[PDB]
Amino acid sequence: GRVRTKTVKKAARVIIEKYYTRLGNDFHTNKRVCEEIAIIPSKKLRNKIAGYVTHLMKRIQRGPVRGISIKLQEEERERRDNYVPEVSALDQEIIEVDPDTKEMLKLLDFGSLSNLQVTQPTVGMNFKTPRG
Amino acid sequence: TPDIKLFGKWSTDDVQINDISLQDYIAVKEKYAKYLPHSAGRYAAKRFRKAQCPIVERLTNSMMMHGRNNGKKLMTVRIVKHAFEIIHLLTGENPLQVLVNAIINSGPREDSTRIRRQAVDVSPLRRVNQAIWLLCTGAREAAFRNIKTIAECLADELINAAKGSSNSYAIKKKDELERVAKSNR
Amino acid sequence: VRRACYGVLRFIMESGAKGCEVVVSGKLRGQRAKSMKFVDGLMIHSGDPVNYYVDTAVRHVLLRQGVLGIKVKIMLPWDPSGKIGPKKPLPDHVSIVEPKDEILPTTPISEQKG
Amino acid sequence: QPIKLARVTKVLGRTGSQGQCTQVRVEFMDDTSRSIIRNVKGPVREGDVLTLLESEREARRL
RNA sequence: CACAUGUUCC
RNA sequence: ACGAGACUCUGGCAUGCUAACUAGUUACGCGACCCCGGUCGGCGUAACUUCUUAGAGGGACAAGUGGCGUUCAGCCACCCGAGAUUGAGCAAUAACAGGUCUGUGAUGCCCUUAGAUGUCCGGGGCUGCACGCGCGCUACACUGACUGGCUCAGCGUGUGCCUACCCUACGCCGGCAGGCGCGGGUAACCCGUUGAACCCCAUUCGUGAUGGGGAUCGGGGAUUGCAAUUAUUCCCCAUGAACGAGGAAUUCCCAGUAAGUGCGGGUCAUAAGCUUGCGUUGAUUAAGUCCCUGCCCUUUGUACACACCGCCCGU
């Protein structure tokens, strides 16, 4: 029956999204941290709020969490989302071209190409699902 | 004696537990030894905290019945302690062994219940619950309006139950309940 | 009875209230007894804070047709000084201080002086 | 007709009209291979053996 | 397996 | 946004902190008594806060592990642990022709207002009894009754602005109820170390409407009050009835819980079978279900809307 409400959870994310380095993993450690970085009115809530923080710390060390704004993971996500491989996914030497979309270029301007070799046609129209 | 225990003067050892179906629900030896059949309590809070209780304390916990005698464990231990000698001065053997054959032989196997009745099997903990119960109310009428005291009736029945001699209340009500279940089975 | 009940509901918002529950019971416009209810803003009902966050006043008015009941209920605002309301904060509000803007060091330097 | 040692090895669910019975996937200490389903009364634990007065009665899965 | 009915100024 | 939660008071653990000649202990030193030791709420002293008490704090979070779960919300299990759900209070939106005009100097309106439905004095009634019903109490016995002995509590209250009326120790007188003389307590002080019952031990009875039961009723004696006859209560003796475990039916309850057992509070001049709290003895059973009784969401059906206790058809 021990299910936390919003004020246990909406507050604990503010503990993480602003104070990540000032905490650790153990409960009584960041229990003693959260008393000075957050004015919690009661003692039982003081054990309540920090208790959800350590449980979410057991998730951040293990994976990414949705409602979290941590400065060190997003820069890690930044460097993988500005990523550029030294070769492109377009710089290919063998551009396999279908026999019909060969024909469409012959009427257009770029009709005769160099690095474009042609395949063989698939025999027998069989492409949609059997009904039932 | 920090090695062995004497239940007043009764030895802890040499009680073979006959049935293997109830031996996981008879706490009577080498982990469950007490000088008294009386602890502070605490056994009746959890679901299966009733499984490791000493059986002689369980009977006293079920003996304080019918109003006026509820909340009087000080005297029901004064009944069974007197009643343990009564078994010994009739048998000569361990009186607690007689209790082992008593709870084994007075627990009904199959029991009808409201489902039209479907006769179904029972739990060993249900079985030790009923076997200790049916004798505990059987002697409750044997001393009722009779010169035979409650100490003897408590001792007389499990003597008649360890042999299944069918002159005790607990044996009769076990086989009738096994038979009326055998009707709608 | 409508115009006057706003006259106290607005008089506290110029005075800086947190919320109010004004209810005018009694008979109005006929023989039948009814109840007016103009609630607005934040206003709590439960908890120990009801003693020191809400100040309750109930009065009666004498007229020719009946006796009307008024519950002038006001939720006090909060102040850490404690001169407009209670000193104690809410049981659920979590005052979290902002992190101070410190620039992380990359160089090991000493500042011996004296 | 035999007294048989049938070891309760897992519980399925509470049954009956008032929820006074529970159904168990019971197994036999007397031979491991055959195993049936049968309602039990009273509080049930895991790994206890039962005493079947008859062995051919099987309960239906609710 | 059975289990019908209603009193109403407001 | 409210309600739930949070919150409050209490319950449990901290030989750490703060201190107690109206709280207790530890010693030391005599007195008494038995064979250096033993005991004592006998008597003083300096060190202490263990017990006394209550102030601050500290302690528990699903915290750690192991399963389980989107591996999210969470759940089951283990260990460490004084606690791995103490109990209550507070408690919304809307609603009822719920109840109170017998709580009022809260009141609209109405009746009455001197031969008064106002006020006071006397006495009676509210207690009255063929009968039905509700909450209760003591019982129906031998796990008992009866008689000695032994021994354990925790909640409270006490001298009244009026108020002339308190809680009570001690010392006597009397079988008892009760009575008389001193002393203290406006209270952690005196009562009071609150010597409670149940209990425990040991008699006696012996399945008998008996020594279970104490209804009814006669006789005597004291208290309170101006006044007790329709017996205010109370003690003594004698009387000793129904009642042999309670049909149909139905109530309350899952942990110090039910029940047993007493003790204070309220009413109180006289006064608890009621009620409100307290401690004491201490469980059986259960860790489940929608069967019943209802209750909360979702769909669906509705000829219902004072709403199925609805509506309505034919003779």
Coordinates of C-alpha atoms (C1' of nucleotides) in Angstrom, one line a residue, chain F residues 34-274:
Chain F
rC34 C1' 19.5 -13.7 62.6
rC35 C1' 23.5 -17.1 62.1
rC36 C1' 31.8 -11.1 57.9
rG37 C1' 27.4 -11.6 55.5
rG38 C1' 21.6 -11.3 55.8
rU39 C1' 17.1 -7.9 55.9
rC40 C1' 14.3 -2.7 56.7
rG41 C1' 8.8 2.6 52.4
rG42 C1' 13.9 2.7 60.1
rC43 C1' 17.1 7.4 60.2
rG44 C1' 20.7 11.1 57.9
rU45 C1' 24.3 12.4 54.5
rA46 C1' 27.7 13.3 49.7
rA47 C1' 28.2 11.1 44.0
rC48 C1' 24.1 9.6 40.1
rU49 C1' 19.7 10.2 36.2
rU50 C1' 19.4 3.4 35.8
rC51 C1' 14.4 3.6 37.4
rU52 C1' 10.8 9.2 38.3
rU53 C1' 9.0 12.9 35.1
rA54 C1' 9.2 15.7 30.2
rG55 C1' 11.9 19.0 27.2
rA56 C1' 14.8 19.2 22.9
rG57 C1' 16.4 16.2 19.4
rG58 C1' 17.6 11.3 16.9
rG59 C1' 14.9 6.7 14.7
rA60 C1' 11.7 3.7 9.2
rC61 C1' 12.3 5.1 4.1
rA62 C1' 9.7 -0.2 0.7
rA63 C1' 15.9 1.5 3.3
rG64 C1' 19.4 -3.3 1.9
rU65 C1' 19.4 -8.0 -0.6
rG66 C1' 16.6 -11.8 -3.3
rG67 C1' 12.7 -12.9 -6.5
rC68 C1' 8.3 -10.3 -9.3
rG69 C1' 6.5 -6.1 -12.1
rU70 C1' 6.9 -1.6 -18.6
rU71 C1' 11.9 -3.2 -14.8
rC72 C1' 7.8 2.3 -14.4
rA73 C1' 4.3 2.9 -10.7
rG74 C1' 4.7 -1.2 -7.4
rC75 C1' 4.0 -6.1 -4.8
rC76 C1' 5.9 -11.0 -2.1
rA77 C1' 10.1 -12.8 0.8
rC78 C1' 14.9 -12.3 4.1
rC79 C1' 18.1 -9.8 7.5
rC80 C1' 19.3 -5.9 10.6
rG81 C1' 16.1 -3.9 13.8
rA82 C1' 12.2 -1.0 19.9
rG83 C1' 9.1 -0.5 15.9
rA84 C1' 8.7 -3.3 8.3
rU85 C1' 0.5 -0.7 9.0
rU86 C1' -0.6 2.1 17.1
rG87 C1' -5.1 4.4 17.9
rA88 C1' -8.0 8.6 17.2
rG89 C1' -8.9 13.6 15.6
rC90 C1' -9.6 16.7 11.3
rA91 C1' -12.3 15.5 7.1
rA92 C1' -14.9 17.8 0.6
rU93 C1' -18.9 18.7 -3.7
rA94 C1' -24.0 18.3 -3.5
rA95 C1' -28.3 16.4 -0.5
rC96 C1' -32.5 15.2 3.4
rA97 C1' -38.8 18.8 4.6
rG98 C1' -33.2 13.7 9.5
rG99 C1' -33.4 16.1 14.8
rU100 C1' -33.6 20.2 18.2
rC101 C1' -38.5 26.7 18.9
rU102 C1' -37.6 21.4 26.1
rG103 C1' -29.8 25.0 25.6
rU104 C1' -30.4 30.3 25.3
rG105 C1' -31.1 37.7 26.4
rA106 C1' -30.8 32.7 18.3
rU107 C1' -35.4 34.2 16.2
rG108 C1' -39.7 35.4 12.2
rC109 C1' -44.7 34.4 12.9
rC110 C1' -49.1 32.8 16.0
rC111 C1' -51.7 32.0 21.2
rU112 C1' -51.7 34.0 26.0
rU113 C1' -50.7 38.5 29.2
rA114 C1' -53.8 39.9 35.8
rG115 C1' -59.5 35.5 37.4
rA116 C1' -52.1 34.9 33.5
rU117 C1' -50.2 28.9 29.3
rG118 C1' -45.7 34.7 33.5
rU119 C1' -43.8 33.8 38.4
rC120 C1' -43.5 31.3 43.0
rC121 C1' -45.7 27.9 47.8
rG122 C1' -48.3 23.2 49.2
rG123 C1' -49.1 18.1 47.6
rG124 C1' -49.6 14.4 43.7
rG125 C1' -47.8 12.4 39.0
rC126 C1' -43.9 11.5 35.4
rU127 C1' -42.1 5.0 39.2
rG128 C1' -48.4 4.2 38.0
rC129 C1' -49.8 -2.4 35.2
rA130 C1' -54.0 -7.8 31.8
rC131 C1' -49.9 -7.1 27.4
rG132 C1' -45.9 -6.8 23.4
rC133 C1' -40.9 -4.8 22.3
rG134 C1' -35.4 -2.7 23.0
rC135 C1' -30.4 -2.0 25.5
rG136 C1' -28.8 -4.4 30.0
rC137 C1' -27.2 -7.0 34.7
rU138 C1' -26.6 -11.6 37.9
rA139 C1' -27.2 -16.6 36.9
rC140 C1' -28.2 -21.6 35.2
rA141 C1' -22.6 -24.3 38.8
rC142 C1' -17.3 -28.7 40.4
rU143 C1' -12.8 -24.6 35.0
rG144 C1' -17.8 -24.0 40.7
rA145 C1' -19.6 -22.0 45.1
rC146 C1' -18.0 -21.0 50.1
rU147 C1' -14.0 -19.8 54.0
rG148 C1' -9.0 -18.3 55.5
rG149 C1' -4.1 -17.1 53.7
rC150 C1' -0.9 -14.9 50.0
rU151 C1' -0.2 -10.9 46.6
rC152 C1' -0.2 -7.4 41.7
rA153 C1' -2.1 -2.1 39.0
rG154 C1' -3.1 2.0 35.8
rC155 C1' -6.4 6.2 34.7
rG156 C1' -8.7 10.7 37.9
rU157 C1' -10.6 13.7 41.6
rG158 C1' -10.6 16.9 46.2
rU159 C1' -11.8 23.0 50.8
rG160 C1' -16.2 25.6 45.5
rC161 C1' -16.5 34.6 44.4
rC162 C1' -22.0 32.9 44.7
rU163 C1' -21.5 28.2 47.7
rA164 C1' -23.4 28.7 53.6
rC165 C1' -21.8 22.4 50.8
rC166 C1' -14.5 19.0 49.8
rC167 C1' -10.8 14.7 49.3
rU168 C1' -9.2 12.0 53.5
rA169 C1' -5.1 9.8 57.1
rC170 C1' -4.8 8.8 62.2
rG171 C1' -6.8 7.8 67.5
rC172 C1' -10.9 5.5 70.0
rC173 C1' -16.6 3.6 70.5
rG174 C1' -19.9 -0.2 68.1
rG175 C1' -20.9 -7.1 64.6
rC176 C1' -22.1 -3.6 60.6
rA177 C1' -24.0 0.7 58.4
rG178 C1' -22.2 4.4 61.1
rG179 C1' -20.3 7.9 65.3
rC180 C1' -16.5 11.0 68.1
rG181 C1' -11.7 13.7 68.7
rC182 C1' -7.4 15.6 66.7
rG183 C1' -3.7 16.5 62.5
rG184 C1' -2.4 17.3 56.9
rG185 C1' -3.9 18.1 51.5
rU186 C1' -6.2 24.0 47.2
rA187 C1' -2.4 18.6 45.8
rA188 C1' 4.1 14.3 42.0
rC189 C1' 3.5 16.6 49.1
rC190 C1' -1.9 14.4 52.8
rC191 C1' -5.1 10.6 51.3
rG192 C1' -1.5 7.2 48.4
rU193 C1' 4.0 3.0 48.0
rU194 C1' -3.3 4.4 45.9
rG195 C1' -2.0 -3.1 49.9
rA196 C1' -8.5 -3.6 43.3
rA197 C1' -10.6 -7.8 41.8
rC198 C1' -9.6 -11.9 38.9
rC199 C1' -6.0 -14.4 41.0
rC200 C1' -2.8 -18.0 43.7
rC201 C1' -2.6 -21.6 47.8
rA202 C1' -5.3 -24.6 51.4
rU203 C1' -10.0 -26.0 53.6
rU204 C1' -15.4 -27.4 53.1
rC205 C1' -19.3 -29.0 50.0
rG206 C1' -20.4 -33.4 45.9
rU207 C1' -24.3 -33.3 40.5
rG208 C1' -28.9 -32.4 45.0
rA209 C1' -33.0 -26.6 42.4
rU210 C1' -27.6 -28.3 46.8
rG211 C1' -23.5 -24.4 50.3
rG212 C1' -25.4 -22.8 42.2
rG213 C1' -29.2 -18.8 41.7
rG214 C1' -30.8 -14.2 44.9
rA215 C1' -36.1 -12.7 42.7
rU216 C1' -40.0 -11.8 46.5
rC217 C1' -41.1 -10.4 51.5
rG218 C1' -41.3 -9.6 57.1
rG219 C1' -38.4 -7.6 61.5
rG220 C1' -34.5 -4.3 63.7
rG221 C1' -30.5 -0.5 63.2
rA222 C1' -27.7 4.4 60.8
rU223 C1' -26.5 8.3 57.1
rU224 C1' -28.3 12.7 53.5
rG225 C1' -32.1 16.1 53.5
rC226 C1' -36.7 20.8 56.0
rA227 C1' -39.1 16.3 54.0
rA228 C1' -38.0 9.3 51.9
rU229 C1' -44.8 6.6 53.1
rU230 C1' -45.1 4.9 46.7
rA231 C1' -40.2 1.2 51.0
rU232 C1' -33.5 7.8 48.7
rU233 C1' -29.8 4.8 50.0
rC234 C1' -27.2 1.4 53.6
rC235 C1' -25.9 -2.8 57.0
rC236 C1' -28.2 -7.4 60.2
rC237 C1' -31.4 -11.6 60.5
rA238 C1' -35.2 -14.7 58.4
rU239 C1' -37.7 -15.8 53.8
rG240 C1' -34.7 -18.8 48.9
rA241 C1' -39.0 -18.2 43.8
rA242 C1' -38.2 -18.6 38.3
rC243 C1' -33.9 -20.5 36.1
rG244 C1' -31.0 -27.6 34.0
rA245 C1' -27.0 -23.9 28.3
rG246 C1' -32.1 -21.3 25.8
rG247 C1' -36.8 -22.4 19.6
rA248 C1' -37.8 -19.1 15.1
rA249 C1' -34.4 -15.7 14.5
rU250 C1' -30.4 -12.2 14.9
rU251 C1' -25.7 -8.9 17.0
rC252 C1' -20.5 -7.7 17.6
rC253 C1' -15.4 -8.9 16.4
rC254 C1' -9.9 -10.3 13.7
rA255 C1' -4.4 -8.5 18.2
rG256 C1' -3.1 -7.4 23.8
rU257 C1' -8.2 -8.0 19.7
rA258 C1' -13.2 -10.7 21.8
rA259 C1' -14.2 -12.2 26.6
rG260 C1' -13.3 -12.3 32.0
rU261 C1' -12.1 -9.0 36.1
rG262 C1' -12.3 -4.7 38.8
rC263 C1' -10.9 0.9 39.3
rG264 C1' -11.8 6.3 38.4
rG265 C1' -15.0 10.3 35.4
rG266 C1' -20.0 12.2 34.4
rU267 C1' -24.9 12.8 36.7
rC268 C1' -24.2 13.3 42.9
rA269 C1' -27.3 16.8 49.4
rU270 C1' -28.5 11.1 49.4
rA271 C1' -26.6 7.9 44.1
rA272 C1' -24.5 3.4 38.8
rG273 C1' -26.9 -2.5 36.6
rC274 C1' -26.1 3.2 32.6

